[PDB]
Structures are given as structure tokens and as C-alpha cells.
Design a protein around this nucleic acid. Sequence first.
DNA 1: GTCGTTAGTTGTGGGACTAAAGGATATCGTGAACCGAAAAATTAGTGTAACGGGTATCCCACAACGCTAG
Length: 49
Amino acid sequence: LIELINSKAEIDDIDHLSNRRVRTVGEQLSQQFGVGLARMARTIRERMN
DNA sequence: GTCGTTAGTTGTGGGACTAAAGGATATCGTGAACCGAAAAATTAGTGTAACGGGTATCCCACAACGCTAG
């Protein structure tokens, strides 16, 4: 950031395709599964409690 | 030296963002036990047939002439 302030570096490009990532079907389903399994684990922990 | 004033920020908050059509969604986690309420189902108990006159109505059939003599 300091090097950027002295006009010695470059600003990142928001629309660059290396800076735009693709969330595929597998990733979205994995994230939703993680949410569901976290809820299930909380329920299991409380039931054991 | 100290206190109120004014203007120019600066951060923060509230309010706008064509028209036409259409218009489907999915929605966790659980603690027990007894009493009261009303809504529902099951059970217990009584019964007619023809007759007298007299008369209201119905259907059903028939009549409602023609001639002669005292």
C-alpha cells in the first residue's frame, strides 16, 4: 500500500479474468453441504450434551 | 490571554433510479406429565281396523217422444 501511495506500483483490475473466479456447481453444492452438515453437527453436539 | 462567531469543510443520513409482458419457488433444532374441556356415540323407550248415518267430490252411462181421442 505504501509503495502504491508513492505512485510506484499499479492498481489491480477488477474486471480482469484472473481476478474473476468461477464458482461451479460442485463448489456451490459443497458450500451448501457444509452449511447443512454444520447445522447437523451442532444438533448432534447438543443432543450428546 | 481568553471566549464567542463565522465560514468552510467533513462525516453521516435520507431519497430518486422508462414503459409493455409475467409472476413457479422453501422454509431445522423437541421436555415431561397430569388435568380439563367438549365433542362424539351408544343405548332405552312405544305399536290399529272397521264401523252407523250423512254428505262432499270423482268417473261413467243415459236422456232430453210422438200420436190419438174426449
